[PDB]
Amino acid sequence: NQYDNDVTVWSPQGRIHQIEYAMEAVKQGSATVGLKSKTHAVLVALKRAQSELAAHQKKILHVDNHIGISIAGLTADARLLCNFMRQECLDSRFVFDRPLPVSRLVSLIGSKTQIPTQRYGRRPYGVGLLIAGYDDMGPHIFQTCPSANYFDCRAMSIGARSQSARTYLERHMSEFMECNLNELVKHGLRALRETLPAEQDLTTKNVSIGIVGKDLEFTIYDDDDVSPFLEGLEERPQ
Amino acid sequence: SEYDRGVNTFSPEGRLFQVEYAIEAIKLGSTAIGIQTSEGVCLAVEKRITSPLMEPSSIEKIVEIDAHIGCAMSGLIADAKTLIDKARVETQNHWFTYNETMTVESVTQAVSNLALQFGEEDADPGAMSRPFGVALLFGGVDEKGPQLFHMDPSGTFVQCDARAIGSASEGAQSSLQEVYHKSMTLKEAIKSSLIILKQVMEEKLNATNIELATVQPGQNFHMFTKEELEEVIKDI
Amino acid sequence: SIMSYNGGAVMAMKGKNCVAIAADRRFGIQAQMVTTDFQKIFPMGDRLYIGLAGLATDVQTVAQRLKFRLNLYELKEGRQIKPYTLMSMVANLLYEKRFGPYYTEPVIAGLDPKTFKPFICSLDLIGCPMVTDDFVVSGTCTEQMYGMCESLWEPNMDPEHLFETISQAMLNAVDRDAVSGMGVIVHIIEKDKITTRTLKARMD
Amino acid sequence: SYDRAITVFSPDGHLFQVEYAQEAVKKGSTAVGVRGKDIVVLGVEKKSVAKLQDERTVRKICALDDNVCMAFAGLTADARIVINRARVECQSHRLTVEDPVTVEYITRYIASLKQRYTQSNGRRPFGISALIVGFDFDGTPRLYQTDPSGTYHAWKANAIGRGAKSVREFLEKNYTDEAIETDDLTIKLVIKALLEVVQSGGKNIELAVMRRDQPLKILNPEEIEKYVAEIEKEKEENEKKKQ
Amino acid sequence: MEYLIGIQGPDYVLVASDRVAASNIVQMKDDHDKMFKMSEKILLLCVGEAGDTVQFAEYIQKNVQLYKMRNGYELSPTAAANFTRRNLADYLRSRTPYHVNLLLAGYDEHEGPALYYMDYLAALAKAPFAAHGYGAFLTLSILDRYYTPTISREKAVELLRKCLEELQKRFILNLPTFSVRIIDRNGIHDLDNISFPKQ
Amino acid sequence: MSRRYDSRTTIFSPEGRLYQVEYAMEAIGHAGTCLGILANDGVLLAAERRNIHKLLDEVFFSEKIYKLNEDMACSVAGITSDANVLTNELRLIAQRYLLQYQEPIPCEQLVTALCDIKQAYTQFGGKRPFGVSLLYIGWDKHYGFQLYQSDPSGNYGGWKATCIGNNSAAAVSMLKQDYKEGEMTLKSALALAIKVLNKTMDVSKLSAEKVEIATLTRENGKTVIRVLKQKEVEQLIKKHEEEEAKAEREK
Amino acid sequence: MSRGSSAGFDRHITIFSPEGRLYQVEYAFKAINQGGLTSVAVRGKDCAVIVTQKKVPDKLLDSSTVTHLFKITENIGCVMTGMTADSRSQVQRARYEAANWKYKYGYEIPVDMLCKRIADISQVYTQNAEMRPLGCCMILIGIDEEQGPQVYKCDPAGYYCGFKATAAGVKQTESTSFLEKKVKKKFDWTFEQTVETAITCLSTVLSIDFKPSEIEVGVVTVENPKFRILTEAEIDAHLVALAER
Amino acid sequence: MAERGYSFSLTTFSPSGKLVQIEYALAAVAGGAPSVGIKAANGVVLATEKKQKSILYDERSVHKVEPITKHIGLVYSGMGPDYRVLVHRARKLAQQYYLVYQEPIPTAQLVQRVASVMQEYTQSGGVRPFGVSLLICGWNEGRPYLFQSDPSGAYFAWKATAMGKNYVNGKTFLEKRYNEDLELEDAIHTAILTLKESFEGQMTEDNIEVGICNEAGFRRLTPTEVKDYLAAI
Known part of the structure; x- marks a missing residue:
């Protein structure tokens, strides 16, 4: 139709269709879950392999010693945004000699990604981000969207089939805050597993875990460092 | 018809139309195969010569990015020229600044950062007007050993044990999946690459129809001469 | 100092129905003479001439740029430029370089097209025009030229008297200047003909 | 400041502007290049002779440098732009490198310029194809072809423009080491290939020859007519003696 | 300081230049060519500030050769001299000025031989003979004394030898060898170097 | 925005054609006839005057013929104000060459520079092309007397005799039949021009106020460019009428 | 061509129709009426008066901020009609232009010069395609020392003119005919007569008896050139005087 | 907000070779x-009609006959604000010419x-052509x-011409009334008569604007002079 090609065209219903299509771009990606306790923020990303002979695509990126992200949607847009966030964190450490507070970084992201939603010939970023951070206010989980809106969350899941993960997180959100690190990671892993097909199970090949905490700088566990977190997982309840 | 939408319009399914069309353009390219073993990476491309009067040596579908990194391309080669030039410049820049060889992954990342830098508005004059119509296989040897990376016009790059790009990449990929095991040797990798290329090539496979190159730990990028090509092909 | 780098002297003088313009012919660099036939007087029309003194490089540059602009003017307008208009064009060209000036001081001698009334003027290096009714001088020996012209000039001279007056003024003025001379060229512009002469001059 | 994207991908993976530039090439007069042992020969069809036109002004064969020359098919004015850019590049290469260009270097430069015009905002691709011949410092004869998309290849012999498919079929059936053993045989091969598509039997042929270490040479109509008479004599001899 | 000299005959131009490249007190090179061949019948002789000379001369050479390629005919020596002067004058007031002194020797099929003098300020003069350097102060008077317009090329070479011998006798600098070229209707010809080999 | 209102002037058509250039050529075909003829002792332009009206003030120099420098002149067909733009550009190019080399610009170089400007408008910028075809006559020391023709596409070519504008194809047929290479003089060339204009201007009879003729010749090492007076064109037309009448009487 | 002919994009961008019209400018003139209000300006012998309709439907709206009367300088006043945000942008531009004119030339801008400047700025919108014209009309009043009171009107087309009296908005045709009748029977217009004429024109074309809160009045006089907006007390005094007669 | 205008032409060639936007202008x-313009032997008269749509309009506020220099005058037919743009540009061009050459710009x-x-x-x-003729x-x-x-940018030199409504009939009237050797007063009478041919209603000294150019320069006629001329007719 005539209203669904340009990001500068309002539809007669008060919507912008290009922004919703970028939202669909985020929904096409593989699932990822983020949750926080009193002291830790955990991202667990289900990685997807294009072929049987390919490595699983990286989903968790370093931003700074206290901030990491997991991505859904267009990977190159995610790399653009990650470079921007890294530059902001380095600017903060250069000027103020302090780590940039997470919510200020998320505000900068929202400001940067709102601009192309109003200018002709631009497009929205087609990437959704889960941002795990730790600062003076404790742990933080943030969700950023192609619409440039962002949410402070107790827990969140984005990507394909993320509604099941969101239901599980709804169920155990009351438990999350008093969990220790291993229990929190296991909650995230169960939520991520709820988005899997029946045949597929969580393995050290398709699971990536990012953790940040009070005394713990942001760390990524990919293949063999994931096994201690996978050990002890009960079989899928079905 | 083609100017109704801008180059940066999302489809209702969340895909950029132009990126999808470039992906479709790559299916018209000649087939390239990369195999990563523990002893090195092998790359093999069908030259796809159209006329007897054309000189096959003037087709360069495998190029040296650096002494330790080579690149096979599929799709629109003229588009791949600028990406390859950028890769060479980035490797030399990294050597100039840090006095060391760039890893294969960081070179692939640098090249992939260019894939979506196209647009009509909010651009400098002469900036890219469309995505590149190429798929690249980077094969190199760095401190992490031998590595093979696939890059596509969407800007996604992935590590691969073995991969086929081009026109027959589906059947060739299925053949790669049965043939490839982790402890494969480089000689077996080269032989299996040539077998699959012979299976999928429309023409008969001789020492002039194909390019084959290897990167190994301790040996630079090496493009197989036609005598070596005939040595390998003699028993297929 | 800069204006005296190459030497040179130009003079224009008004007659009854005629003009005269004369220049020395030496091209030299400081004390060393290089050539003795350097052109300093350029035609800008059938009855219009501009003489340039100062840096030889700026003499050549300004003559060529003025020829550029004058040719464009005479193509856009199907007429020959008037001497007053040429003076204004030269002044505009010089003032465009107010802070990076060309080191030349032009002298313009001509007859009005369709009127044939004599016109002479001089300009400074940044293009301040000065129209006189008797004579204008420019170059490295303007004091000597002023002495000669103030003594010898008379109103309503016929072209032969004008030639003798401007010739004697130029010869005796450049005989008294170290970096000018090596010959004098005189143009007499009347309405029906132009006479060019080279004077017998000292060559030291 | 005009920043429109003119060359874009179509849903089937095609760049329609590049294909249309190729169709513009296909409407140009035929050009044939043959690479010999000691000689490279270029030959261009003249689609019509106006009989009032100054020939020197409409030549389709031009020298890029002392050792490099090119013919083209397609749009003449685009060809003029490309040729001037290549000439500037050849001079700058003689300056920054103290040697002349190889044929492949200037071919690469031309091809990359064309590719840039297929992928930059606010401009359409060039509508020409080029045959570039010359000799390297090693004395090797070189023949290359560039197309509007920006791809270039090396050829033993090639044809571009209208009717280039039949001329290429003829060259594939005819190009041989024995057929290029001498310079005269190479020239006759070029003229025979052109005669497969041109009318009036050799009055519509412009022919140029580059020999090793020698500047570009243009055959005057007398030499072309003498070669055509030789070719027709050989045709008659073969027909009568074999039949 | 580097020496240039040109003598224009009725149908030829003879040019010579010193072959010394010096830095501080040491002759670094003793066979240094200061002549640049713009075209088949044009020579540019350039002296002056190090770096400036070759940059400007090669820029001019590139442009003259490009003109020949674009147009199919060559620039005349007068046109080339004026192009050189215009470029030098434009550079004079720019951010990259060239401190070069030039002789342009040329032969035109219609205008005959031509010799042009250009100082670093980009004043262009046409001269029957000219010289550049401190050694010009010692040889211009000899040229004034012995030159005639009808001088033959062998008499021209002898007169040049007189000038160079005067340079040997009186000039404080050691200039032992000179490159000599002649331009005529048949193009540029390299004559034997005029040398004064110290025992 | 831009995209939906953009005319796309500088893009290829599916057949490999440039539509705006072809339509500019149609505009050229509409305009008044200009003819160029080269002889051994000069060259001439003869243009049909389309500004014919009794209330029009007499033209200053010429309606369609523009001097470009001391040695060259041109005639235009197509859009008039576009032709004004182009003639100003040509004068600037010639003076730039004169400033650079201190010699007059050769004719082909001037034509080539203007044609490069035209081609640039055909390839990038999204602007419409110039709707002007030009005839150039000139003299230079390289090739003597020269006649050139240039199109809105930026193509140019040299000619012995050529025509642009209204009925240019019939005029070209006349020229092919009647022009004699290597033997034309300015008198015979003027006679041929009068006959060609008689045929091409079929609706309106040849009168001296309907045509403008300019000749370029050499005198004493100077180039002389002169538009013929009305009486001279009247005499040429009278001579042509006498020639036609006597040729009829013979037949 | 044909009456009301259209070709291409002449209904969407400011390009000529086959009849030579600019449809977007006409649509902007309709945008003026979209506001739904009407204003009248009348020139006296020693004064100029602008009276605009003031409508405040709801009590939640602070009435003091609902004005179409603005002061451009101390001595120049204006009434705006049409789209409110376009009107306020034009008011800001007019204030800037006046201040800059005073700064550059050292005396206050004449009313006709300010009107001409605004009109030039809007003609630019009529000739450039990437922006729409403003949907507002500006009426300026002031006192020129040489020529007395001045009423000038500029419209979206870039057309401007001086008026003896003028109107803008929904009922401006009826208002113009009423003012034509009043100006034909020319009698010496004092300040009171000018104000009453403006108010009675508005009240007769809107077919309502007015209240001091329903209209807004601004005046300039020769005695007091400064532009001043009448308070509700002065307006009620004028309304009482008009009602008794 | 974005201040970038369109960079593509809005006037392009039609398949028949015409620029339709210029024809619509x-x-x-x-x-x-x-x-109407009439060039007499010793001057030029430019006469236009300015019939306001109402008596509420101040006739003296706006002018259609405009001075460009002391010796050049302008009048138009078409769209008034385009005319104002062109008047401002012409005045600036005349001033720049005077600044370079220090003489008044020739009319041509x-x-x-x-x-x-x-x-x-x-x-x-991104622009349309001007919709006026000068x-x-x-x-x-x-x-x-x-x-x-004209709006295309083509100019013509005239001895007498008419623009606007009924300009074909005005041209016929001019060519059957104009003669050389005419004086400025008789040219003024002829210009007023040409306006009268296409005028609707009564012509007064306020319905029309007249400017004259002679050796003394260019000037607009005051309504009293126009009234005298109208009385003479």
């Missing part, structure tokens, strides 16, 4: 108020520069000049 001109030169501006608007990006009068070298400049 000419249609706009042909719908304008009648204008100013006409050429104004026509160049109009052509620019026929070709540049009649330009001047006195130079003891000689009167009358030019007409």
Whole structure:
């Protein structure tokens, strides 16, 4: 139709269709879950392999010693945004000699990604981000969207089939805050597993875990460092 | 018809139309195969010569990015020229600044950062007007050993044990999946690459129809001469 | 100092129905003479001439740029430029370089097209025009030229008297200047003909 | 400041502007290049002779440098732009490198310029194809072809423009080491290939020859007519003696 | 300081230049060519500030050769001299000025031989003979004394030898060898170097 | 925005054609006839005057013929104000060459520079092309007397005799039949021009106020460019009428 | 061509129709009426008066901020009609232009010069395609020392003119005919007569008896050139005087 | 907000070879108020009608006959605000010429520069052509000049011409009334009669504007002078 090609065209219903299509771009990606306790923020990303002979695509990126992200949607847009966030964190450490507070970084992201939603010939970023951070206010989980809106969350899941993960997180959100690190990671892993097909199970090949905490700088566990977190997982309840 | 939408319009399914069309353009390219073993990476491309009067040596579908990194391309080669030039410049820049060889992954990342830098508005004059119509296989040897990376016009790059790009990449990929095991040797990798290329090539496979190159730990990028090509092909 | 780098002297003088313009012919660099036939007087029309003194490089540059602009003017307008208009064009060209000036001081001698009334003027290096009714001088020996012209000039001279007056003024003025001379060229512009002469001059 | 994207991908993976530039090439007069042992020969069809036109002004064969020359098919004015850019590049290469260009270097430069015009905002691709011949410092004869998309290849012999498919079929059936053993045989091969598509039997042929270490040479109509008479004599001899 | 000299005959131009490249007190090179061949019948002789000379001369050479390629005919020596002067004058007031002194020797099929003098300020003069350097102060008077317009090329070479011998006798600098070229209707010809080999 | 209102002037058509250039050529075909003829002792332009009206003030120099420098002149067909733009550009190019080399610009170089400007408008910028075809006559020391023709596409070519504008194809047929290479003089060339204009201007009879003729010749090492007076064109037309009448009487 | 002919994009961008019209400018003139209000300006012998309709439907709206009367300088006043945000942008531009004119030339801008400047700025919108014209009309009043009171009107087309009296908005045709009748029977217009004429024109074309809160009045006089907006007390005094007669 | 205009042409060639936007600008001109120019032996008269749509309009506030220099006058037919743009540009061009050459610009030169501006608007990006035709009068070298400049950027020199409504009939009337050797007073009478041919209703000294150019310069006629001329007719 005539209203669904340009990001500068309002539809007669008060919507912008290009922004919703970028939202669909985020929904096409593989699932990822983020949750926080009193002291830790955990991202667990289900990685997807294009072929049987390919490595699983990286989903968790370093931003700074206290901030990491997991991505859904267009990977190159995610790399653009990650470079921007890294530059902001380095600017903060250069000027103020302090780590940039997470919510200020998320505000900068929202400001940067709102601009192309109003200018002709631009497009929205087609990437959704889960941002795990730790600062003076404790742990933080943030969700950023192609619409440039962002949410402070107790827990969140984005990507394909993320509604099941969101239901599980709804169920155990009351438990999350008093969990220790291993229990929190296991909650995230169960939520991520709820988005899997029946045949597929969580393995050290398709699971990536990012953790940040009070005394713990942001760390990524990919293949063999994931096994201690996978050990002890009960079989899928079905 | 083609100017109704801008180059940066999302489809209702969340895909950029132009990126999808470039992906479709790559299916018209000649087939390239990369195999990563523990002893090195092998790359093999069908030259796809159209006329007897054309000189096959003037087709360069495998190029040296650096002494330790080579690149096979599929799709629109003229588009791949600028990406390859950028890769060479980035490797030399990294050597100039840090006095060391760039890893294969960081070179692939640098090249992939260019894939979506196209647009009509909010651009400098002469900036890219469309995505590149190429798929690249980077094969190199760095401190992490031998590595093979696939890059596509969407800007996604992935590590691969073995991969086929081009026109027959589906059947060739299925053949790669049965043939490839982790402890494969480089000689077996080269032989299996040539077998699959012979299976999928429309023409008969001789020492002039194909390019084959290897990167190994301790040996630079090496493009197989036609005598070596005939040595390998003699028993297929 | 800069204006005296190459030497040179130009003079224009008004007659009854005629003009005269004369220049020395030496091209030299400081004390060393290089050539003795350097052109300093350029035609800008059938009855219009501009003489340039100062840096030889700026003499050549300004003559060529003025020829550029004058040719464009005479193509856009199907007429020959008037001497007053040429003076204004030269002044505009010089003032465009107010802070990076060309080191030349032009002298313009001509007859009005369709009127044939004599016109002479001089300009400074940044293009301040000065129209006189008797004579204008420019170059490295303007004091000597002023002495000669103030003594010898008379109103309503016929072209032969004008030639003798401007010739004697130029010869005796450049005989008294170290970096000018090596010959004098005189143009007499009347309405029906132009006479060019080279004077017998000292060559030291 | 005009920043429109003119060359874009179509849903089937095609760049329609590049294909249309190729169709513009296909409407140009035929050009044939043959690479010999000691000689490279270029030959261009003249689609019509106006009989009032100054020939020197409409030549389709031009020298890029002392050792490099090119013919083209397609749009003449685009060809003029490309040729001037290549000439500037050849001079700058003689300056920054103290040697002349190889044929492949200037071919690469031309091809990359064309590719840039297929992928930059606010401009359409060039509508020409080029045959570039010359000799390297090693004395090797070189023949290359560039197309509007920006791809270039090396050829033993090639044809571009209208009717280039039949001329290429003829060259594939005819190009041989024995057929290029001498310079005269190479020239006759070029003229025979052109005669497969041109009318009036050799009055519509412009022919140029580059020999090793020698500047570009243009055959005057007398030499072309003498070669055509030789070719027709050989045709008659073969027909009568074999039949 | 580097020496240039040109003598224009009725149908030829003879040019010579010193072959010394010096830095501080040491002759670094003793066979240094200061002549640049713009075209088949044009020579540019350039002296002056190090770096400036070759940059400007090669820029001019590139442009003259490009003109020949674009147009199919060559620039005349007068046109080339004026192009050189215009470029030098434009550079004079720019951010990259060239401190070069030039002789342009040329032969035109219609205008005959031509010799042009250009100082670093980009004043262009046409001269029957000219010289550049401190050694010009010692040889211009000899040229004034012995030159005639009808001088033959062998008499021209002898007169040049007189000038160079005067340079040997009186000039404080050691200039032992000179490159000599002649331009005529048949193009540029390299004559034997005029040398004064110290025992 | 831009995209939906953009005319796309500088893009290829599916057949490999440039539509705006072809339509500019149609505009050229509409305009008044200009003819160029080269002889051994000069060259001439003869243009049909389309500004014919009794209330029009007499033209200053010429309606369609523009001097470009001391040695060259041109005639235009197509859009008039576009032709004004182009003639100003040509004068600037010639003076730039004169400033650079201190010699007059050769004719082909001037034509080539203007044609490069035209081609640039055909390839990038999204602007419409110039709707002007030009005839150039000139003299230079390289090739003597020269006649050139240039199109809105930026193509140019040299000619012995050529025509642009209204009925240019019939005029070209006349020229092919009647022009004699290597033997034309300015008198015979003027006679041929009068006959060609008689045929091409079929609706309106040849009168001296309907045509403008300019000749370029050499005198004493100077180039002389002169538009013929009305009486001279009247005499040429009278001579042509006498020639036609006597040729009829013979037949 | 044909009456009301259209070709291409002449209904969407400011390009000529086959009849030579600019449809977007006409649509902007309709945008003026979209506001739904009407204003009248009348020139006296020693004064100029602008009276605009003031409508405040709801009590939640602070009435003091609902004005179409603005002061451009101390001595120049204006009434705006049409789209409110376009009107306020034009008011800001007019204030800037006046201040800059005073700064550059050292005396206050004449009313006709300010009107001409605004009109030039809007003609630019009529000739450039990437922006729409403003949907507002500006009426300026002031006192020129040489020529007395001045009423000038500029419209979206870039057309401007001086008026003896003028109107803008929904009922401006009826208002113009009423003012034509009043100006034909020319009698010496004092300040009171000018104000009453403006108010009675508005009240007769809107077919309502007015209240001091329903209209807004601004005046300039020769005695007091400064532009001043009448308070509700002065307006009620004028309304009482008009009602008794 | 984004201040970038369109960079593509809005006037392009039709398949028949015409630029339809310029023809539509000419249609706009042909719908304008009648204008007449007559070049007499010793001057030029430019007469236009300005019939206001109401008596509420101040006739003296706006002028259609405008001075460009002390020796050049302008009048138009078509769209008034476009005319104001062109008047401002012509005044600036005349001043720049005077600044370079220190003499008043010849009429033909100013006409050429104004026509160049109009052509620019026929070709540049994102603009429509001007919708006016200009009649330009001047006195130079003891000689009167009358030019007409069209929206395409083409200009013509005229002895007498008419623009706007009924301009074909006005041209016929002029060519059957105009003769050489005419004086300025008789040319003024003829111009007023040409306006009267297409005028509707009564013509008064306020319904029309008249400017004259002679050796004394260009000036607008005061309504009293126009009333005297109308009484003479």
